[model samples]
Target chain A: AKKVRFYRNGDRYFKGIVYAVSSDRFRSFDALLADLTRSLSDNINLPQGVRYIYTIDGSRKIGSMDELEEGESYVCSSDNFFDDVEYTKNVNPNWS
Target chain B: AKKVRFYRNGDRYFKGIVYAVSSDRFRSFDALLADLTRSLSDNINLPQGVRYIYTIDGSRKIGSMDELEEGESYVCSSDNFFDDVEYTKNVNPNWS
Candidate 1:
């Protein structure tokens, strides 16, 4: 099991939720997304739905569950979220 | 600038050093590698040199500086480091 943390796209503080997921359970990105939707629905409210899942700094968009790693944090974005450049810029400040 | 944490390969505790790096400073992977080598030489003793720099969980190998993100931890490995499978397996336990 891997401890994956998910943060809202605009949450600069990175106050996201953590879930224990079995890496081998999900073979595709869609499967993992569906599971995250079901599991995190009660915890987080995504009105536009999670259209993009990216790394903490928004440097990379996660395309598959295999790209996820234990103890690493990620960002979940809705359809109305900011563009990559803006998003990365917004989060970069919090890191340094 | 981004706060990038670098852990030596096999450091399951994730107690790596953190450095503030300008994202736009290096355009190529080799350039960033050279910088890291010079900057971290006194801090870390990499006899074989950093041949591979991976994500904290070993999910991805960082090929370029652009792939680096703020507040994210990474792993630096020498030529004698373990293979991807074994390295990931070893780090998974610490995350969960």
Candidate 2:
């Protein structure tokens, strides 16, 4: 199984996870966005008309839902997708 | 073999790759940073007096270079490690 993280940027910003499941397939990136829109509404209490966008694995923007890969990561938020980090010693090591 | 990517945030921000080799094991995170300092000086022409920091896999900040995992990703730059994504569709699919 694979997971795609979700982030919401309505006034503030937050993140969530969308686990892949059976009968879950999409034809294009827009299809994935449509699915994510519904998923956020039910899971994260996303409002009906809030405009949102997404990024693939939190780095590059997702141009199309052409295909999906297991273990691939995605973020659905804004510029503040992350908290921000300064150049220093000692790092927080909790990650995939 | 493992690769830890390097990011520099001097006046600007940039990322690089550090190929692991023999005699590269360390006792603590500081040791790794020491090695990275040397690596950057030799490879990236980093200034000696510039203070810097790092993050593991670009998600969590690295509090210590206690140990590193093979295939693990690290970002040694700042909050601008990435160009920025606007959550639209059609993502650039060039990633590991």
Candidate 3:
């Protein structure tokens, strides 16, 4: 069994811990999104549906469902990868 | 003006370049999705709506629309985030 933690939009909606039986359950990054959305549908809105992507730990951009590893934290969001100015503005707001 | 390149589902549909006047145009990660979907709607099929997430440089996982920066490549997907066995399988079926 494999365990993965999930966050929605970098804490936009839900930033709780979720688990998966095995990494095999997921085929692509979207597959991971599907399972999370499926299990969390009753808990969150998931406005992005199976389309939302995720981040590992707070920065790593998850482009493919291929590179995910166990013991890593996954943050799902309704946006794209941001860093520098965009990261500062959207994530920390106060970052100058 | 700011420039951000986009990749969809690790080549699931469209692998192209997109530009943003300023990162501010995006409020959250979803904002980027909105713009991409709007502009690319005529070209690709964004099954996820304003929810799909992205990865910068095919690795970094995008959680919020916060971290996007310039000169960085982003790969968006409709999954949760996959890696290792998942990456090997989904990204390249011939990996086995």
Candidate 4:
């Protein structure tokens, strides 16, 4: 359960970031959110909804946490074999 | 448990309307949601929070689907004794 923190506006609100434990590696959702702020600078859209719609594919999203540090932009694509279970693509906010 | 369906942009994602049964006599959360869409019609602000921040007051909000049928707008006020419980105030999204 990777932390998928929800951010408000360009800035953060109250607790700022909030998420549960994740298998990925950002430690906590809060940590991931902090990183995102530093990497991205544009207003992005996450499409309002519930916890990833509580679905396997709906919940988790990928983004630039201060940037990829490597590739162009992280890609979280959905393929026949590589669905949400396989890849977590770009959820960059550094650029709108 | 109640179903709190999240709306996608101006459209209703894949399911269009999704919500668990409600105690408000609306049958289900979907029922109330449908009513709201018709009551409010302005690009209103939601403060953008998570599942009502998973709180009672935060979760349930009263809004007009198209526009207020009566008052300036329904009021979903918060107070000491009158928090999200006392009243399910205005959730006017028909106006941005």
Candidate 5:
């Protein structure tokens, strides 16, 4: 099984606690998103109405769970969340 | 100016030397791809015919230079290159 991490938008350091998701269990991206919403709602308030997860860089919206890679960091946000938060090294965890 | 790194698909360690691109210079995504094809042809043989660049995970196709983030790594390949090269920890430079 592959492990993936999710972070809230604007959390540059990823300081908030989040569960590492097991990729093999979910059949589709929608299911994964649903589960993530239900599970993380208590700790991280995912924006309501038409939300989606994306790569840390916010370049691509994840269409399916199949697109997720093992041990990669992804971000969760409301649709158009990136418009307010522009891409920057400060927000990209992978940037060195 | 923001700096971005590009890697040839399938180079697990990013062993092939590549120039870091300055994001501000390019007017569009197509312009960036054209320049990359010309400059890296000597070291990296980007596939012919239709091709595009994507985030390292191959989750999203970059449509505009605006989608790119500072100091992030992206992948270069033919349109369907990820079909053969599945997303693995090995190919993901950011994975620990």
Candidate 6:
């Protein structure tokens, strides 16, 4: 099991699970993350819609042996945007 | 009709209409902009926040009698998402 984290400026925007290895030949974490990103681009828009600038900033790649703490998403960020340095710094030390 | 432009780093993001004043029956510009920013942060979460880094930057207030060139929305950005300079340029000249 691989964890994909979408982040920007040290902030997590989006995340999901990617099955790197499969029993019946399943999917990959990266693939799942990409799919999520593409769909969002196609969906979220203005005029009273989902509110966020960048939901999926980038992804966090985790090895199979890693264990994410209870409240943490396999993928995470400090603020909401990974491009903002200030935000990144603020959220840097927080890992779940 | 006042136009509210949401932007950041010299870019446009979430935008809307602000009545500014009254209308026992009506709305305002800034109020609308604020609402947009809040809502986006609420709905869509990880996996995709609308494929953007910042949806609402700041509102561009336009006095009444404003002219909206076609293929264009009362609220728009050089780039689909504001705060992206390179992107802003790539789409700046495009009026649609």
TM-score for candidate 1 (chain B): 0.63
- Each model's TM-score for chain A is 0.63, 0.43, 0.55, 0.22, 0.64, 0.25
B1-96, model 4: which lDDT tens digit per residue?
344433322121111223333455475444554554553333452223111111222333434233212222122222212122121111111211
Error of 6 at A44 (Å): 28
C-alpha RMSD by candidate, in order? 14.3, 12.1, 17.5, 16.7, 15.5, 17.0
- lDDT per prediction? 0.59, 0.44, 0.49, 0.29, 0.56, 0.29
Off by over 4 Å in 4: A1-96, B10-20, B27-33, B38-40, B43-96
In candidate 2, how many Å is residue B69 off? Answer: 4.2
* Maximum-DockQ candidate: 2
Grade the docking of candidate 4.
Answer: incorrect
For candidate 3, what is the DockQ-based docking class?
A: incorrect
lDDT of 1 by residue, B48-96 (tens): 6677887755666887776889878676776534433211111112222
| Per-residue lDDT over A30-87 for candidate 5, one digit per residue giving the tens place of the 0 to 100 score | 6777777765554535556226877766677887766777767667775565432322
Interface RMSD of each: 15.3, 14.0, 17.4, 17.1, 13.1, 14.8
Interface CA root-mean-square deviation for model 2: 14.0
Q: Better model by TM-score, 4 or 5?
A: 5
lDDT of 4 at A51: 16
In the order shown, the candidates' DockQ scores are: 0.02, 0.07, 0.02, 0.01, 0.02, 0.02
User: Where is model 5 more than 4 Å wrong at Cα?
Assistant: A1-96, B16-24, B42-44, B83-96
Task: Please give, for residues A27-91, the per-residue lDDT of candidate 3 as tens digits.
Answer: 56666677777755553445564354455434556666555567565655555642111111111
Best by lDDT: 1
Better of 2 and 4 by TM-score: 2
Model 6 over residues A1-96: C-alpha lDDT tens digits? 433332222222222333233323335434433443443333322222212223222233343323322223232222333332212111111121
Query: What lDDT score goes with residue A72 in model 5?
Result: 71
- Per-candidate TM-scores read 0.37, 0.29, 0.34, 0.20, 0.38, 0.19
Q: Flag the better candidate by lDDT, 4 or 5.
A: 5
What's the TM-score of candidate 4 when only chain A is evaluated? 0.22
